[PDB]
Amino acid sequence: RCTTFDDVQAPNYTQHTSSMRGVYYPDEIFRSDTLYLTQDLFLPFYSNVTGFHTINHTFGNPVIPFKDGIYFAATEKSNVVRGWVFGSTMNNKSQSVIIINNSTNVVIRACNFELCDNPFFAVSKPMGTQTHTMIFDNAFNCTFEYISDAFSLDVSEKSGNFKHLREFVFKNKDGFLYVYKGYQPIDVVRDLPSGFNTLKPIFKLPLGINITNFRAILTAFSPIWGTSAAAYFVGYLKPTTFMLKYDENGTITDAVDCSQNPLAELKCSVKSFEIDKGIYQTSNF
Amino acid sequence: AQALNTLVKQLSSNFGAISSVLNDILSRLDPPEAEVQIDRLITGRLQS
Amino acid sequence: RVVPSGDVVRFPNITNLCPFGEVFNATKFPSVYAWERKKISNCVADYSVLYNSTFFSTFKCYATKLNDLCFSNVYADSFVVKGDDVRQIAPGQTGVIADYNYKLPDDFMGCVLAWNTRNIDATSTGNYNYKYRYLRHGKLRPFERDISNVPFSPDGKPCTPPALNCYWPLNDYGFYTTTGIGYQPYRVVVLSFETVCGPKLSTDLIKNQCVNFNFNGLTGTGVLTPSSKRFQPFQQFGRDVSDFTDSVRDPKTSEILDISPCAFGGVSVITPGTNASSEVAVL
Numbered sequence: 089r090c091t092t093f094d095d096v097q098a099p100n101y102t103q104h105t106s107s108m109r110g111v112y113y114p115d116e117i118f119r120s121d122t123l124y125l126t127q128d129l130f131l132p133f134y135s136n137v138t139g140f141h142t143i144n145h146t147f148g149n150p151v152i153p154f155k156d157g158i159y160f161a162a163t164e165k166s167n168v169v170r171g172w173v174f175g176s177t178m179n180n181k182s183q184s185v186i187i188i189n190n191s192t193n194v195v196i197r198a199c200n201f202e203l204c205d206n207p208f209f210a211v212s213k214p215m216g217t218q219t220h221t222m223i224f225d226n227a228f229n230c231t232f233e234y235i236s237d238a239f240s241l242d243v244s245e246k247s248g249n250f251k252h253l254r255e256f257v258f259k260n261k262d263g264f265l266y267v268y269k270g271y272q273p274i275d276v277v278r279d280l281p282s283g284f285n286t287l288k289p290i291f292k293l294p295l296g297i298n299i300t301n302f303r304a305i306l307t308a309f310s311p312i313w314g315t316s317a318a319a320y321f322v323g324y325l326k327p328t329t330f331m332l333k334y335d336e337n338g339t340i341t342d343a344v345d346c347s348q349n350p351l352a353e354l355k356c357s358v359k360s361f362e363i364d365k366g367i368y369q370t371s372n373f
Numbered sequence: 374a375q376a377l378n379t380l381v382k383q384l385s386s387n388f389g390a391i392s393s394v395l396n397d398i399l400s401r402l403d404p405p406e407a408e409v410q411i412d413r414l415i416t417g418r419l420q421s
Numbered sequence: 422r423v424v425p426s427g428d429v430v431r432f433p434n435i436t437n438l439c440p441f442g443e444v445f446n447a448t449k450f451p452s453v454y455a456w457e458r459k460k461i462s463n464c465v466a467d468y469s470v471l472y473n474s475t476f477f478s479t480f481k482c483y484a485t486k487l488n489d490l491c492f493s494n495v496y497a498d499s500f501v502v503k504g505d506d507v508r509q510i511a512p513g514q515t516g517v518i519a520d521y522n523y524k525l526p527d528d529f530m531g532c533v534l535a536w537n538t539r540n541i542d543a544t545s546t547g548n549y550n551y552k553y554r555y556l557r558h559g560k561l562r563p564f565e566r567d568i569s570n571v572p573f574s575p576d577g578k579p580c581t582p583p584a585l586n587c588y589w590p591l592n593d594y595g596f597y598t599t600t601g602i603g604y605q606p607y608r609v610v611v612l613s614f615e616t617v618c619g620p621k622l623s624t625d626l627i628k629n630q631c632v633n634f635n636f637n638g639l640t641g642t643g644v645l646t647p648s649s650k651r652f653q654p655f656q657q658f659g660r661d662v663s664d665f666t667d668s669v670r671d672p673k674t675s676e677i678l679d680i681s682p683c684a685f686g687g688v689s690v691i692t693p694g695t696n697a698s699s700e701v702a703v704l
């Protein structure tokens with residue numbers, strides 16, 4: 089049942105600089121003791137991002153553009169952002185994809201959904217359990233249906249600092265929505281910590297929808313729904329040139345965005361992290 | 374070391390073919406489509 | 422040259438050649454914008470059933486791309502085009518079929534199988550019930566379906582039918598029986614190519630010998646031997662400091678192997694001369 093909130097407020101829009109985020113393993117190719125220069129839809133370094141503080145009435149999930157691919161991050165305490173609606177019009181007018189983590193399974197379906205104007209997880213706040221997927225009610229002319237393996241995730245209201253950081257990377261190609269996951273534990277007061285954290289491929293999703301927009305399904309918290317504390321970002325993926333440093337085990341240890349500043353473009357010309365003193369020729373203007 | 378790696382990386386030049394792999398043009402393409410693009414990658418690589 | 426001795430065909434669990442009624446036996450096909458998805462999985466397929474059919478006429482594959490098969494799911498997609506829109510069914514090639522109705526991936530590519538249905542799927546006034554998209558705010562990506570039965574806004578402004586100067590996204594094909602081939606309806610099965618494998622058998626690891634090999638996603642000749650390379654769980658194979666593949670995780674048994682190439686070299690000939698003797702030694 090499509091219900092609404094008692095009040096929906098805009099987030100704090102706290103500005104943040106995502107330093108080393110969005111790095112992932114693009115291919116299936118193991119390489120070792122090497123240094124590989126390539127281009128894909130990456131999050132650029134030092135990206136100017138906004139902290140969507142979702143707090144207690146404040147609930148930021150309208151239509152946000154996707155356009156090729158988005159970066160997502162969320163320092164989490166109450167496990168609020170766990171779903172994303174993908175699609176074009178975000179109404180019951182075109183085919184859309186609702187990927188949810190419903191505290192038990194990852195349920196993915198690609199249909200003309202009876203989309204609510206407020207995409208949320210209808211979750212009882214005092215114990216963190218979901219009553220209904222109040223994002224859709226029914227669906228028509230489907231192409232895909234997926235239910236992952238079972239687990240359990242605690243999604244109640246939590247205090248203290250952020251203890252969980254997940255990194256997500258989405259893109260549309262060949263019908264395959266690619267979804268990758270990064271993770272680290274954290275102890276975080278405000279928006280995001282800096283640091284290098286990679287992502288690994290998790291989903292290959294032949295959904296078949298015109299992915300032009302996205303709506304992040306946040307988790308609603310009320311015992312008239314509300315919410316509670318999480319800070320999540322929206323970043324954009326760009327077809328930029330990265331260097332990829334590979335260690336003994338094929339772990340991406342470090343990277344250079346070639347288009348930040350003339351120092352880093354020089355790094356990509358030399359193909360090293362070490363540059364000697366001098367003048368080196370680079371691309372014409 | 375630069376002259377070897379220049380010789381290595383010009384294997385991956387497509388030279389106007391659908392790819393730089395002679396075996397993909399051999400096995401995947403139709404044999405009329407093959408012989409034209411085998412002809413392109415040799416004339417590229419031999420003169421490189 | 423060292424000439425190889427052995428065949429190494431290593432694949433996960435092998436089934437038979439499946440019957441594919443979705444490929445050559447279906448009776449009615451819909452319009453292209455809302456093309457019906459029918460899919461193939463877990464089959465050692467060759468799609469000779471596209472040929473051996475009483476229901477089709479063209480038999481063309483975008484035709485040795487028939488056996489272009491060691492990859493993920495094949496989607497035997499069902500739709501009816503016009504003869505002037507058969508031509509726009511391709512990976513890329515954004516005419517009115519590929520731009521707005523049905524676009525194909527270009528990693529591997531299968532077969533566009535069509536049939537002359539002038540006596541069944543058309544009429545003398547144009548079978549206008551089949552329609553196709555010619556105008557939408559946004560292009561399709563490859564392998565997408567548009568099921569929008571919605572009046573359309575021609576520039577993103579609130580101008581939908583039934584308001585004036587507000588356009589429908591669908592044109593009539595014009596399936597006329599009184600015209601030539603360019604206006605005729607074709608029932609089209611497209612094998613959209615993006616788990617099957619055509620040459621999929623199972624042989625044994627002929628280790629430490631110059632052999633032929635076919636792996637899931639990998640062909641060539643070389644020397645096969647177990648490897649110590651620390652594959653991530655989401656990694657299929659390895660490459661060297663060049664751009665040649667040197668290691669692979671076994672598609673059958675997950676054994677990490679090395680692939681060194683087969684041996685070769687030049688020949689010198691050592692001789693003291695014909696005035697001295699008539700014998701040689703070779704390097």
Ligand SMILES: *[C@@H]1O[C@H](CO)[C@@H](O[C@@H]2O[C@H](CO)[C@@H](O[C@@H]3O[C@H](CO)[C@@H](O)[C@H](O)[C@@H]3O)[C@H](O)[C@H]2NC(C)=O)[C@H](O)[C@H]1NC(C)=O
Nearest residue numbers: 120121333334335336337338339340341649650651652653
């Ligand atoms: C790539 O992964 C391998 C895992 O196979 C890493 O090797 C492991 O590295 C650790 C730390 O260097 C080794 O621990 C050492 O143990 C000895 C004896 O207990 C101790 O005296 C040392 O202080 C150290 O803690 C571990 O033995 C070793 N294991 C193997 C099988 O080699 C390797 O370090 C990774 N590569 C990189 C670049 O980190």
Ligand SMILES: *[C@@H]1O[C@H](CO)[C@@H](O[C@@H]2O[C@H](CO)[C@@H](O)[C@H](O)[C@H]2NC(C)=O)[C@H](O)[C@H]1NC(C)=O
Nearest residue numbers: 100101102103104105106134135136137138139
């Ligand atoms: C990132 O974008 C934000 C806007 O959301 C910038 O914040 C404002 O920037 C202007 C000029 O750059 C200043 O005059 C304002 O005072 C800033 N407002 C706040 C609340 O910070 C921010 O400067 C951008 N980042 C960088 C490095 O320029």
Ligand SMILES: *[C@@H]1O[C@H](CO)[C@@H](O)[C@H](O)[C@H]1NC(C)=O
Nearest residue numbers: 692693694695696697698699
């Ligand atoms: C062959 O070698 C001998 C050395 O004993 C030399 O005398 C002779 O001239 C050589 N043959 C010719 C055709 O020069």
